């Protein structure tokens, strides 16, 4: 991931911003990759071992849902807490 973080210096913030926007229901790896390309114009820089990579990013969470899907989400930080709170309580 050294190579990734070197080439994509804001990857932590980019991933967190995607997860934050999807925090009501969380988001799968496939959808993170899709959203990443849409928002940045570049393909997500990892193909495999993505769960492990995502879990090196401060405040990122993962869950094995009862549905079987692996869902990623976010814990509130001091700088984003106001936004996370709004997303979690906005229209269903």
């Amino acid at each position: 991931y050294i190579s990734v973080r070197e080439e994509y210096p804001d990857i932590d913030s980019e991933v967190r911003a995607i997860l934050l926007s999807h925090a009501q229901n969380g988001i799968t790896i496939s959808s993170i990759k899709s959203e990443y390309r849409k928002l940045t114009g570049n393909p997500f820089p990892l193909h495999d071992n993505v769960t492990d990579f995502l879990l090196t990013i401060p405040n990122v969470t993962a869950e094995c849902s009862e549905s079987g899907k692996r869902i990623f989400n976010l814990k509130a930080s001091l700088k984003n807490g106001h936004l996370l709170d709004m997303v979690l309580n906005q229209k269903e």
Binding site: S13, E14, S21, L39, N80, L83, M86
Partner: protein, 153 residues
């Protein structure tokens, strides 16, 4: 209102916005196209030490009002709002309006910049070609310089 239009490709916008905010950020409203774009940008900017909130159509009324109060009271230096949710916003005397995504209707441009004064817009030549002629007319009507890229559309 001092109006400046930059020609900016879609994926160069974020860096251009950060360059502008780094010079001066306080009292800036940034208009974007989508709800997800609004929250993404507000999160990203907040992590870059510009306390930024957002308003969009998925927000309950109380949440829109709170976001606006935070911007007004000074706790949030930047407000990101969608093109659509912008039309109903009651705020004026904005220091800086930034059209991160150009509106599709010139009436929206006129209304958005009527909220500030200083207005900066990012014109994406692969998306905004249709509004160029109307933009030229507004710039002329406002006695503002017209950049060549707008006339060549």
């Amino acid at each position: 209102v001092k109006q400046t239009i930059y020609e900016v490709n879609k994926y160069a916008k974020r860096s251009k916005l950060i360059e502008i905010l780094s010079e001066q950020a306080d009292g800036t409203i940034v208009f974007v196209e989508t709800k997800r774009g609004a929250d993404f940008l507000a999160s990203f900017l907040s992590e870059k030490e510009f306390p930024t909130t957002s308003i969009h159509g998925d927000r309950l009324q109380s949440q829109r009002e709170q976001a606006l109060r935070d911007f007004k009271n000074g706790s949030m230096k930047v407000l990101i709002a969608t093109s659509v949710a912008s039309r109903g916003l009651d705020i004026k005397n904005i220091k800086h309006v930034i059209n991160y995504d150009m509106p599709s209707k010139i009436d929206d441009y006129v209304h958005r910049i009527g909220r500030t004064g200083r207005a900066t817009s990012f014109f994406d030549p692969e998306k905004d070609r249709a509004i160029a002629a109307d933009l030229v007319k507004i710039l002329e009507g406002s006695g503002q310089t017209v950049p060549d890229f707008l006339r060549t559309c």
